[PDB]
Each structure stands twice: as C-alpha cells, then as structure tokens.
Amino acid sequence: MDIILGIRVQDSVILASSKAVTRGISVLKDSDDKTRQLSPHTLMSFAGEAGDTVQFAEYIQANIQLYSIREDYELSPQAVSSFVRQELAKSIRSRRPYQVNVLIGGYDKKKNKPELYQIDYLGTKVELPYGAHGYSGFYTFSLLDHHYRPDMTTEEGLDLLKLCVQELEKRMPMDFKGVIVKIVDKDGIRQVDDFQAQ
C-alpha cells in the first residue's frame, strides 16, 4: 500500500507520506500529497481505497472548517480526531464503508503540546508518540522503538524519519517515489521542501 508515517517530537508533529499513485501496471503520479489541512494547527494524512481516500479527507475538512467559522474557534486536535473516529466508526456498518486509514497530527494551542492520533478504517483510534498505517509500521517500528525519545528536537525527528524512509526504500518491494514531509507546531503547518536529499 502507500506510506503513512507520523512522529510526535518535543514541540511538533511530523508527517511523512509517499508521493506515488499507482493504478495497476503504471505509476500515474509521483508528486501526490496524501494530506489535508483541517485547521491552521491540525493536519491529517490518509491512505486507502482509490476513491474514498480523498472524498473522506475533503468531507472531514469541510466539516472542521465549517465548525471553525460557526464558532470562531479551533477544535483541539483531540476533539477533531474524536469526531473523525466517529465518522469512520459509523460507516463501518453501513452499505458501503469508507476504506480509509488516517493520521491526525496537530498542535494544541491550549495545552501547548503536539499530538498524534492514528485511526484505521474501522474507527479504531489510538494516541501515539509515532505511528504508521499498513505495511509501513512493519519496517519502521523497530527503528522508532529504538531511537525514539520524547524530547527530540524537530531536527532530530526529521533525521529519525529519514532513517525510516531509507529502511523502507531498501527492504520494501514497491517504489513509493519518496515522501512529502510536513511539520505541525505552535506556528502552524509547513512543508519541508528538502527531503529528496537532506
């Protein structure tokens, strides 16, 4: 499948997501962004079923933005993820369930702490220091389990990722065409346009 990695360091959350988009025999795109910004300080990455993936993302996005405007306030990463879990958990027993896995990473401007939530298509939500979806974890978790420290600087975080991405490029069968990385901190969401050779 696709790559969905997330790591909560000291003062931020980092999301790495593969850029490839393959439809059977060919690789249609190598510059895809498997992420949406739900609020100025909350980001969501996603992977899964061909169509449901973006549709779900954009549906969740629209709702969070509507809440923001209605209340002139930003829901906490926790609230946002609880809302997303309920959405997934509802469609699991519906006629046609959304087959999407997500990673929600945001910075709680109220508690002044970064947060990382992992939710699978079933509606199983869990808060973690770092997480991945699909086969991604099978390779990276041992590295992260080893090198992870709660007080890592954003810089140490990116180095740890870079390490995971390398293990993924070595042992994993498919070419996911590298990743796009993004940082969520007290100052919002920004993309590290230099990971192709950092």
Binding site: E58, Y59, A62, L66, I69, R70
Partner: protein, 241 residues
C-alpha cells in the same frame, strides 16, 4: 403536514406577510455599510432599552459567512441565525465542489433565494430579516456590498442602510457619498460610516460598532476606543463651525 398558504396575494396585488415581514426590519436596530476603494465597512447600532449585558459572549451583529465575507442584518434576531447558518454551510459546500470560495454576489444570490422560497411555500412565514453582505471575491481587490430583503430581491450598493431610521441615515449618505471619489482610505471610510450612524444613535460610544473588511480575508472589528476616537474627532468637526 402543515402547509396552509400563509403568504398569498391580496386584491391589490400585495403579499401582506412579506409586507409585514418588512415592518419587522424597520423595527430592528439600524445597520449600514459603505464601500471604499480598497475596503468595505459595516456599522451597526447597539440598543439601550436594557443594559447590564455581557458583550463578550452576547451574539455580535456582524457575522462571518467565510474568511472573506461578512453579513449584517436588521430585524428578528432568531431569524437571522437560520440564514447565517444556511449561508455558512452553502459557503463550505461551494468550496468543496467548485474548489474555490464563494463570490459575494453568489453568496448573496443564495441567501436571497432562501428568503424568497419562504415567501411561496406552505406552512412557513417569511424571514423578518433584511441583510447586508460585503466582502471581496477570491483573488480580487474590488470591494462588494450587497443587500437582500424578505421579498427575495437583492442588489449591490455603493453604500446602504437598513433598519430603524434607515431613511434618515440613507439621506445622509445620499448627499455625502460621491461615487466619483469614494473614501480612498480605510480611515476616511470608517469616518463616513460613524458620521452617518451618529445621525440616529444619539451619543453612543458603546452604541456603535464598526467592522472593516479588506482584500484577502482581512476582517477586523474595532474596539470601543478606536471608535470613540472617531466619535471624539467627528464632534469637533461641528463645533469648529
């Protein structure tokens, strides 16, 4: 199950329910809006029949339908909410499908349609509301100011007012707003606005709130002080004569 036709024509060709819906607007507090050359300003008056409120949490008179468009109104408050809501939802829906925020004209057109529909549907009475919608189209720098009413009709204005004593204040604006040279400053624009409100608010430092909307989702409301400062200088303009 309830469909009784409440809004119907009368012998002279009037739809009294819409007519009376308008009388409700006349009663609502006054609201005004004037467009500059690179901004639009919205002024409204706060009542004083009862005072001891908590302005922090009490609903304000100018609402954001989206980051780049605001909406103010005159008439029944409870009704305005229902419209504000549908507008905000339609605003998000539009971004979700057309992949671009709404243009002020469109958002206005939508709100007006809603109002109109309630004039010829059974079991419902018209909205006792009239509105001012202002903002800047996406990636545009030309200001937009629109106004809608119970009838369902809408149109744009260089400046306009709705609510009680809107006649008086409209008159002020008709002989004080030169289309040839519209307030070229965010400054002089807010001034012209306050000046008009002062014709009806009768001394109301806390009874007058202004909001300034500029290009690229730049909306902001002034605090009693900034306003009070405008009032203070405007009252001197008269006594220096």
């Amino acid at each position: 199950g309830y469909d009784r036709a409440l809004s119907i024509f009368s012998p002279d060709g009037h739809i009294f329910q819409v007519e009376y819906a308008l009388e409700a607007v006349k009663r609502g507090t006054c609201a005004v809006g004037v467009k500059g050359k690179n901004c639009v300003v919205l002024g409204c008056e706060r009542r004083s029949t009862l005072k001891l409120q908590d302005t922090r949490i009490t609903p304000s008179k100018v609402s954001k339908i989206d980051s780049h468009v605001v909406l103010s109104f005159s008439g029944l408050n409870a009704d305005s909410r229902i419209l504000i809501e549908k507008a905000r939802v339609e605003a998000q829906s539009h971004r979700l499908t057309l992949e671009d925020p709404v243009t002020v004209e469109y958002l206005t057109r939508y709100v007006a349609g809603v109002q109109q529909r309630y004039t010829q549907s059974g079991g419902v009475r018209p909205f006792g509301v009239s509105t001012l919608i202002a903002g800047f189209d996406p990636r545009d720098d030309e200001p937009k100011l629109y106004q809608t009413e119970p009838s369902g009709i809408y149109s744009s204005w260089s400046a306009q007012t709705i609510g009680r004593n809107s006649k008086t204040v409209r008159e002020f604006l008709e002989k004080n707003y030169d289309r040839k040279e519209p307030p070229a400053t965010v400054e002089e624009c807010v001034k012209l606005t306050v000046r008009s409100l002062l014709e009806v608010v009768q001394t109301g430092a806390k009874n007058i709130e202004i909001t300034v909307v500029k290009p690229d989702s730049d909306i902001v409301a002034l605090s009693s002080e900034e306003i009070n400062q405008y009032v203070t200088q405007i009252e001197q303009e008269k006594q220096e004569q």
